Amino acid sequence: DIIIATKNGKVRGMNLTVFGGTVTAFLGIPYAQPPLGRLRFKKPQSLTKWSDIWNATKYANSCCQNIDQSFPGFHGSEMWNPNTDLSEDCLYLNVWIPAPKPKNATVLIWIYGGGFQTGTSSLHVYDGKFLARVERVIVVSMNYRVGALGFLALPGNPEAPGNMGLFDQQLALQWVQKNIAAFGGNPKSVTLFGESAGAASVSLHLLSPGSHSLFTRAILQSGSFNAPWAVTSLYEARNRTLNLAKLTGCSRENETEIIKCLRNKDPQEILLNEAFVVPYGTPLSVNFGPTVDGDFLTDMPDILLELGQFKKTQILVGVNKDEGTAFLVYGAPGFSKDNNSIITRKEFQEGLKIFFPGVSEFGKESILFHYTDWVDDQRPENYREALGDVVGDYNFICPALEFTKKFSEWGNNAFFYYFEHRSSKLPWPEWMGVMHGYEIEFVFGLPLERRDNYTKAEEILSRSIVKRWANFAKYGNPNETQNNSTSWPVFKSTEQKYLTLNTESTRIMTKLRAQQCRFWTSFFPKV
Amino acid sequence: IIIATKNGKVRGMNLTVFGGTVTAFLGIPYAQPPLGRLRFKKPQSLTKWSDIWNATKYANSCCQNIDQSFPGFHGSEMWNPNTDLSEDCLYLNVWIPAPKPKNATVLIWIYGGGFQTGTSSLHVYDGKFLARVERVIVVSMNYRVGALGFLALPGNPEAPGNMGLFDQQLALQWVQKNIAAFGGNPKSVTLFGESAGAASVSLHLLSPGSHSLFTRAILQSGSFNAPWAVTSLYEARNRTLNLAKLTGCSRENETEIIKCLRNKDPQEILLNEAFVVPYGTPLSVNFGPTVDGDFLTDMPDILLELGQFKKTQILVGVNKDEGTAFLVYGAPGFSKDNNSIITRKEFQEGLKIFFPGVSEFGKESILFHYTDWVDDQRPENYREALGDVVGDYNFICPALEFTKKFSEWGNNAFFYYFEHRSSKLPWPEWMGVMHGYEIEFVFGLPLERRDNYTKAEEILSRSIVKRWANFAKYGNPNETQNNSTSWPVFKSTEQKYLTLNTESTRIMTKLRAQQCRFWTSFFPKV
Numbered sequence A: 001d002i003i004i005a006t007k008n009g010k011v012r013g014m015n016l017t018v019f020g021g022t023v024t025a026f027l028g029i030p031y032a033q034p035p036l037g038r039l040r041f042k043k044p045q046s047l048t049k050w051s052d053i054w055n056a057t058k059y060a061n062s063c064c065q066n067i068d069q070s071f072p073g074f075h076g077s078e079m080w081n082p083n084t085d086l087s088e089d090c091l092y093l094n095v096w097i098p099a100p101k102p103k104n105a106t107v108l109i110w111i112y113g114g115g116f117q118t119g120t121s122s123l124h125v126y127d128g129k130f131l132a133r134v135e136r137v138i139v140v141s142m143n144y145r146v147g148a149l150g151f152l153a154l155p156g157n158p159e160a161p162g163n164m165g166l167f168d169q170q171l172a173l174q175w176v177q178k179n180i181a182a183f184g185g186n187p188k189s190v191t192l193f194g195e196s197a198g199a200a201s202v203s204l205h206l207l208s209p210g211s212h213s214l215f216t217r218a219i220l221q222s223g224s225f226n227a228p229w230a231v232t233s234l235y236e237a238r239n240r241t242l243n244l245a246k247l248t249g250c251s252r253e254n255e256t257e258i259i260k261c262l263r264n265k266d267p268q269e270i271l272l273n274e275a276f277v278v279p280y281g282t283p284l285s286v287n288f289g290p291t292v293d294g295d296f297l298t299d300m301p302d303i304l305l306e307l308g309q310f311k312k313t314q315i316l317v318g319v320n321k322d323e324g325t326a327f328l329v330y331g332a333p334g335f336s337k338d339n340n341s342i343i344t345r346k347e348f349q350e351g352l353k354i355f356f357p358g359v360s361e362f363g364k365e366s367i368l369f370h371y372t373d374w375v376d377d378q379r380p381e382n383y384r385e386a387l388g389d390v391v392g393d394y395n396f397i398c399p400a401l402e403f404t405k406k407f408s409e410w411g412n413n414a415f416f417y418y419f420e421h422r423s424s425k426l427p428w429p430e431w432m433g434v435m436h437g438y439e440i441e442f443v444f445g446l447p448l449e450r451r452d453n454y455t456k457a458e459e460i461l462s463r464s465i466v467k468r469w470a471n472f473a474k475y476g477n478p479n480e481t482q483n484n485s486t487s488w489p490v491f492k493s494t495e496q497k498y499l500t501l502n503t504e505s506t507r508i509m510t511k512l513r514a515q516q517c518r519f520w521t522s523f524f525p526k527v
Numbered sequence B: 001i002i003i004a005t006k007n008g009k010v011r012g013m014n015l016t017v018f019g020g021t022v023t024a025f026l027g028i029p030y031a032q033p034p035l036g037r038l039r040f041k042k043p044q045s046l047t048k049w050s051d052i053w054n055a056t057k058y059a060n061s062c063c064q065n066i067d068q069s070f071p072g073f074h075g076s077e078m079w080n081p082n083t084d085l086s087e088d089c090l091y092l093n094v095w096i097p098a099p100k101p102k103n104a105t106v107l108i109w110i111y112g113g114g115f116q117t118g119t120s121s122l123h124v125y126d127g128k129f130l131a132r133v134e135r136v137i138v139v140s141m142n143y144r145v146g147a148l149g150f151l152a153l154p155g156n157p158e159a160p161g162n163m164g165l166f167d168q169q170l171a172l173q174w175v176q177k178n179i180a181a182f183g184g185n186p187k188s189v190t191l192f193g194e195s196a197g198a199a200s201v202s203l204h205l206l207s208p209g210s211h212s213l214f215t216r217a218i219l220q221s222g223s224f225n226a227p228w229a230v231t232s233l234y235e236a237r238n239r240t241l242n243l244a245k246l247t248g249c250s251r252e253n254e255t256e257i258i259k260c261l262r263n264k265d266p267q268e269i270l271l272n273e274a275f276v277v278p279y280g281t282p283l284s285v286n287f288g289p290t291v292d293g294d295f296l297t298d299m300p301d302i303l304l305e306l307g308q309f310k311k312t313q314i315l316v317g318v319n320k321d322e323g324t325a326f327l328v329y330g331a332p333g334f335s336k337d338n339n340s341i342i343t344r345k346e347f348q349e350g351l352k353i354f355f356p357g358v359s360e361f362g363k364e365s366i367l368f369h370y371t372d373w374v375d376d377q378r379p380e381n382y383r384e385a386l387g388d389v390v391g392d393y394n395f396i397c398p399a400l401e402f403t404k405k406f407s408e409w410g411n412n413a414f415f416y417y418f419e420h421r422s423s424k425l426p427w428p429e430w431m432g433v434m435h436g437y438e439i440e441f442v443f444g445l446p447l448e449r450r451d452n453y454t455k456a457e458e459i460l461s462r463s464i465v466k467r468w469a470n471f472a473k474y475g476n477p478n479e480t481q482n483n484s485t486s487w488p489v490f491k492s493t494e495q496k497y498l499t500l501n502t503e504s505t506r507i508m509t510k511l512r513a514q515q516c517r518f519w520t521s522f523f524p525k526v
């Protein structure tokens, strides 16, 4: 039998046979009291104890969401929808462990993305089963509340203070600090890593004083808090929740009364008016997300970073080649996953229309000018590949690079990567290229499974990425081997050296999209 | 040494040049003196004189203001007129090889000076060298500048505008009725000018009245599509009415405005030209070419795109640091005697001066486009950038943009990039290769070896002299010096140009492409 005593009681797991070895999994362990009606919107409250032996043999419920319905049956959009049944009773975590039991293993904890409006820890692509076998690490992933249930903000009010989903993540980190040693883990060798909103969440735990002693290092895949979508100001967050109050018919006059209504509305009706809280939305809009709550975040995050008020620690940051493409099929005119989606100049301007609603026409025009210096002026996809770069450069790449630059200026080693390989099984058309969120499959080592129809070169690349991610976790250095391996240098604001990741050849280069990033950091703000 | 023109006889003088001799005729009147009743009018054709005319010395320069910002300084004073100033100035010069040729091609020089100054008699325009070594006849005119040459009361024949341009055209008419008596070919005639002269040359390609009077054109650091070259009708009229108010001639109708101006002392007109436009810059042309419906039948950009111009091969070019010559005249932090390093804010102040009417975002847009340093450590960054901002916008990008459209219509276009700084140039080193300091090289001044030039400058000058002359004769500045670069032809896609310096002569593509795309595709929307 497979049992282990937690500070909250005993829990039993299951054996899995992987690559000829065995990995022990504990799926759906509760870490906080169910945030049911009274506690809804409150911070997660700590567990007491449970009866008998919890069987952690099945993924738990996903926290409440809307689902991607745009293309039914399509694996590309379906793979990101929650694969468990959805509920407010949803604060659970998973633990994968190498067998035989490790004495003092390093722990990796995954924080899923999804724009702070979706996500779950039970997707196939987040299966930690492999990482535990290949590199003998302990992998933990947790469900955190998302959407209005997770980040409704009336700061100063304990009934709905904002940043609850972040406080869900934080208490899960506290649980690992309290328990993972029983599992054979090292609570002082703990590395956070997430993608998109998960990477943004990871970046903010570096700022929050409460998380400064719950983890050792951080990995940020295609996300950082200084992205335009990550953090919303204090009073637009409140303007958002006052609007949701009316939309649901319970604008009352003193705040705790308005939460009293929202606690009695079924989770659905809250979920289907989350989208009307903003007057002018883009495909990349975060209606209810992180905010400056005065508890998790004591100031606007860009300031905290500029003043060095953060955890001093190694970080591994990176991005994909075509991060913007995934969002154009979700509103940009002329774009479809079933075309090759070659647009014309006016369709391009109508695209900026969508992604930059409140920007002046002089500002749109300057964005166009900076991305229209065609090296070859006869190729149609010029305007198609331009807007995908605009969306990706402004929302992911240039903030991630700018965050690393500012972070490295305070004396801690930073390593930047540029993921350039398109998966052989990518169900989207290839005009979308190396898409957002499609490096995760290689991070978790899915191409190591031989029965999955991945190429041999994709297994080699996945085997490499996995070794470097785990080596960064254990040692703070993303090496692969001492010999026969391209050395990954540190990112420092002068040379700005990054490492490319693909199947042809990994090599060192400098100043990633520096001519494009200069526009977004030094000219677009003044517009 | 006398020659019978169709208006009379003129006497010349023998010049001993490089051991040989060249015969010079300095100061032959090609038009009636534009005085009294004739001020502000198009040049009147001249009647014959029964005596013999003495063309033995340079004639008087046209009335103009004089650069006295740096008294004593050879660098600013070498452009001032070297003869007396007078409204009686419509004269030309002719240099001719000895032994006299009988159908040499002829090169006509149109001087620059912002349409405000200039004269044919300056040492850097001495045509005697060109006639000696390349055996070509060289002609230079004096055309009215300032308000006396370009004041425009549009539609009114008493002050129609572009009078100085008609001055040039009447000189061009003269060479065609008289250069055969000098040994010249009236049907193999090349116009070359610099700055306002090159601008003037480009507008002769558009004027139908001048289609009959030359063959090819060479345009040094100037074109009509340059921002300073042509002033709009509304601008020209406001400018004319402002000069009337300043000189006490604000009156009832236009013909009374003009009679009052005809009675003003010449200096009462030139000393008020500076106040005629409120937002003047260093490069400001107070009175210049306009669309008069006579010399220019409408707006030049139009006529160019529509294809109504003389179809012929041209030679266009610029110098590496065109804009540096103007930062000395008003840009804060600059000086002839400093090293002239400026702050970012001093740079932003300089932008305000050269771009007075542009919005704050527009200046901010210029600042960003020229702040992509290759090395940020260098303190010279902001001083070099504004010099390039002024150079690109005012000269380089217009010249390239002019050459592209012209070559499009199936004409042989040749573009050069002059990169050599004269070892004699009296301005400081930081100004680099300045506006106008390729002229002495084109006129072959380094060819006389007692003038303190480097012999590298002699080789450089003699080659420029040869290609300029061969472009005039043949329509391709080939230079027969064994192994030497084949000057190819400018074309819209590859856009190949020829470098000029003592070290070597290379061949390149798309000059200042990243910079010029800003000035042609984005800045007209700020």
Ligand SMILES: *[C@@H]1O[C@H](CO[C@H]2O[C@@H](C)[C@@H](O)[C@@H](O)[C@@H]2O)[C@@H](O[C@@H]2O[C@H](CO)[C@@H](O)[C@H](O)[C@H]2NC(C)=O)[C@H](O)[C@H]1NC(C)=O
Pocket: A001, A052, A053, A054, A055
């Ligand atoms: C979690 O575990 C068992 C389910 O079945 C497990 O039984 C273990 C003894 C072990 O062999 C494991 O491999 C196997 O999957 C539930 O056990 C209860 O108690 C006895 C123990 O053998 C079972 O026979 C009963 O069927 C079962 N239910 C009872 C007694 O009501 C255990 O309850 C389950 N936990 C929960 C919360 O359901």
Ligand SMILES: *[C@@H]1O[C@H](CO[C@H]2O[C@@H](C)[C@@H](O)[C@@H](O)[C@@H]2O)[C@@H](O[C@@H]2O[C@H](CO)[C@@H](O)[C@H](O)[C@H]2NC(C)=O)[C@H](O)[C@H]1NC(C)=O
Pocket: B238, B242, B245, B246, B275, B276, B277, B278
């Ligand atoms: C057309 O001219 C007017 C007046 O021009 C005046 O400018 C002085 C510098 C001087 O030459 C004087 O003799 C002449 O009368 C211009 O109007 C001026 O515009 C500025 C704004 O740039 C105002 O601050 C002035 O008060 C105003 N003055 C007058 C008398 O109107 C005008 O700008 C100019 N250009 C146009 C109309 O396009």
Ligand SMILES: *[C@@H]1O[C@H](CO)[C@@H](O[C@@H]2O[C@H](CO)[C@@H](O)[C@H](O)[C@H]2NC(C)=O)[C@H](O)[C@H]1NC(C)=O
Pocket: A103, A104, A186, A188, A189
């Ligand atoms: C697991 O490893 C950790 C460190 O990775 C051990 O804890 C500490 O080790 C470092 C020494 O480098 C120091 O901070 C302390 O000496 C240790 N902490 C203590 C003693 O509280 C930890 O001992 C290891 N655990 C096991 C079971 O091997």
Ligand SMILES: *[C@@H]1O[C@H](CO)[C@@H](O[C@@H]2O[C@H](CO)[C@@H](O)[C@H](O)[C@H]2NC(C)=O)[C@H](O)[C@H]1NC(C)=O
Pocket: A471, A475, A477, A479, A480, A481, A482
């Ligand atoms: C990656 O590089 C680090 C650099 O030191 C290596 O770290 C050492 O790892 C051994 C375990 O093999 C430890 O006992 C040492 O204490 C570590 N040294 C330091 C300075 O941290 C690491 O081994 C390398 N990884 C691989 C796979 O070669």
Ligand SMILES: *[C@@H]1O[C@H](CO)[C@@H](O[C@@H]2O[C@H](CO)[C@@H](O)[C@H](O)[C@H]2NC(C)=O)[C@H](O)[C@H]1NC(C)=O
Pocket: B252, B253, B254, B255, B256
């Ligand atoms: C121009 O304006 C003046 C303003 O007076 C007019 O000049 C008059 O001319 C007529 C006939 O030549 C005479 O009666 C007077 O000698 C002039 N006026 C005065 C006050 O002496 C002239 O007619 C105007 N021209 C026009 C309107 O075309």
Ligand SMILES: *[C@@H]1O[C@H](CO[C@H]2O[C@@H](C)[C@@H](O)[C@@H](O)[C@@H]2O)[C@@H](O)[C@H](O)[C@H]1NC(C)=O
Pocket: A484, A485, A486
């Ligand atoms: C790993 O090396 C492969 C070849 O083996 C190495 O052996 C060294 C001793 C030396 O002789 C070299 O010939 C080789 O580098 C090479 O073909 C692979 O590409 C390398 N693979 C990785 C992932 O680095």
Ligand SMILES: Cc1ccc2c(c1)sc(-c1ccc(N(C)C)cc1)[n+]2C
Pocket: A066, A067, A068, A114, A115, A116, A117, A118, A196, A197, A229, A283, A284, A285, A286
């Ligand atoms: C209605 C609906 C359903 C699903 C859904 C959304 C909206 S929005 C979203 C999303 C994902 C990522 C991001 N960023 C990376 C900023 C923003 C939003 N999902 C997954």
Ligand SMILES: Cc1ccc2c(c1)sc(-c1ccc(N(C)C)cc1)[n+]2C
Pocket: A068, A069, A070, A080, A113, A114, A115, A196, A283, A284, A326, A327, A330, A436, A437
């Ligand atoms: C209804 C709606 C509107 C927008 C929208 C979505 C759904 S979904 C989406 C998106 C969300 C997640 C992901 N990954 C995590 C790969 C990629 C794209 N956008 C931008």
Ligand SMILES: Cc1ccc2c(c1)sc(-c1ccc(N(C)C)cc1)[n+]2C
Pocket: B065, B066, B067, B113, B114, B115, B116, B117, B195, B196, B228, B274, B282, B283, B284, B285
């Ligand atoms: C007061 C004064 C005196 C002389 C003088 C000026 C002003 S301005 C000038 C001038 C020369 C060239 C140009 N461009 C070709 C742009 C514009 C102006 N000169 C020769």
Ligand SMILES: Cc1ccc2c(c1)sc(-c1ccc(N(C)C)cc1)[n+]2C
Pocket: B067, B069, B079, B112, B113, B282, B283, B325, B326, B329, B435, B436
């Ligand atoms: C008082 C004043 C103001 C402006 C100004 C001058 C004098 S002079 C000048 C200038 C004139 C001619 C030349 N060349 C012939 C090369 C170069 C620069 N600007 C632009």
Ligand SMILES: *[C@@H]1O[C@H](CO)[C@@H](O)[C@H](O)[C@H]1NC(C)=O
Pocket: A001, A002, A015, A022, A099
């Ligand atoms: C699970 O772990 C290993 C798998 O090899 C084994 O020693 C142990 O007995 C297994 N327990 C089971 C299958 O109940």
Ligand SMILES: *[C@@H]1O[C@H](CO)[C@@H](O)[C@H](O)[C@H]1NC(C)=O
Pocket: A334, A335, A336, A339, A341, A342
């Ligand atoms: C792409 O598909 C959409 C929807 O079917 C359509 O509106 C658009 O015209 C298509 N693009 C092209 C180039 O056909």
Ligand SMILES: *[C@@H]1O[C@H](CO)[C@@H](O)[C@H](O)[C@H]1NC(C)=O
Pocket: B011, B051, B052, B053, B054
């Ligand atoms: C022409 O020059 C001759 C040179 O001998 C001189 O005598 C004569 O005065 C000049 N012509 C006139 C009209 O003075």
Ligand SMILES: *[C@@H]1O[C@H](CO)[C@@H](O)[C@H](O)[C@H]1NC(C)=O
Pocket: B102, B103, B180, B184, B185, B187, B188
């Ligand atoms: C002068 O030159 C032209 C060459 O283009 C020629 O037509 C003419 O016959 C030549 N000879 C003369 C005018 O005596």
Ligand SMILES: *[C@@H]1O[C@H](CO)[C@@H](O)[C@H](O)[C@H]1NC(C)=O
Pocket: B333, B334, B335, B338, B339, B340, B341
């Ligand atoms: C350049 O000279 C000007 C005036 O002489 C002055 O304003 C400026 O400070 C000087 N800059 C130097 C000396 O660096």
Ligand SMILES: *[C@@H]1O[C@H](CO)[C@@H](O)[C@H](O)[C@H]1NC(C)=O
Pocket: B450, B451, B452
């Ligand atoms: C050459 O140099 C000396 C002084 O340095 C000068 O006297 C001589 O006239 C110069 N040549 C000229 C000015 O043509």
